[PDB]
Amino acid sequence: GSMMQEKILSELAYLRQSIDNFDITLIHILAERFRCTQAIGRLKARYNLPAVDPLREQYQIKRLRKLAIDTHFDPDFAEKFLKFIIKEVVHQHEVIAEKQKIKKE
Template sequence: MTDQDASTELARLRGTIDNIDAALVHLLAERFKCTQQVGELKARSSLPPADKAREERQITRLRSLATDAGLDPVFAEKFLNFIIAEVIHHHERIAEGK
């Protein structure tokens, strides 16, 4: 592969990465819009911000989906936990009226 070929291929791959990153941002934005509504519903109904049983079910499902998709399930679990921790933080702020 020539240097020119390599830089053309790298630019093509980076274009794909940029598209995927954009899709991830849009998906996350939609998820957080939805969890914002969940947070407001929970605050109105005096429900606790976290639901560990639901999280267990989500993790089991995501790990299985990840394995089937060829993604490291440990990474998928960490990623979901990272997102959920942020959501719980948002829920707590909503419940505090902030």
């Protein structure tokens, strides 16, 4: 139909409003997460702690996987997602350390 075509484009539009809202929300939460991990980066750099903390990484992954299963959410994708975030964090930790070091030199 044309009534049916519009019904379908209207549903699509409605679902995309929601997605678009989720994406803003996700960015605001990640903004705060990165405020925290940057406070960790400064602390690690001042006191010579390493960017990659394997016991920490391992815990975060097992925990998020368990919580993902409990939410009926794919645990492999939860892990892929967390690892994506952690790679940026590890980069940021290294950038803060190089910048604390260039002051010291």
